[PDB]
Design a protein around this ligand. Sequence first.
Ligand code: M7G
Length: 163
Amino acid sequence: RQRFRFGRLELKRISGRGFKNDEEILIGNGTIQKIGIWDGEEEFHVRCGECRGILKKSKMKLEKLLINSAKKEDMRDLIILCMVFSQDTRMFQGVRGEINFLNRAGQLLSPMYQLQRYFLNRSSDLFDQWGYEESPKASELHGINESMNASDYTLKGVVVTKN
Ligand SMILES: C[n+]1cn([C@@H]2O[C@H](COP(=O)(O)OP(=O)(O)O)[C@@H](O)[C@H]2O)c2nc(N)[nH]c(=O)c21
């Protein structure tokens, strides 16, 4: 279970096993792109900068992300990166602009890394497409909105702890 990266995101497996299959994904800008889609419930310690979290995913779905509160920019990037890494259907649909899967020399680019790069610059569109649900009714857990503020609605599947 060794530490590994997905760009700015760092992960370490807690549980589960994924199996990858290539699928044709309809992305939110109207294009269809072939992307390795993971199947399986998997769970990971995650990190971005000084922000720690726990992520659970299943096929094309962020099941849950529990983050330990931290500087806001690092909370926000951790959230964006977990949305991309979960391969959630809503994340794909959130892409409204152009995305290239070849560079200017005609070289091959990673669809997932390209998504990461796209969304770290377009998080408002992502949060807007992703949506909100009621925050937890427990004292030791709080909701978080698009501004990384504690709120009565939280990004779906995302909760913050101070413990
Ligand atoms: C080894 N390991 C790699 N990743 C991710 O899967 C994606 C691989 O995408 P890629 O690097 O473009 O390779 P590919 O086109 O051959 O599919 C990246 O986002 C990796 O972070 C993985 N993702 C999951 N869910 N489970 C894993 O065990 C795992």
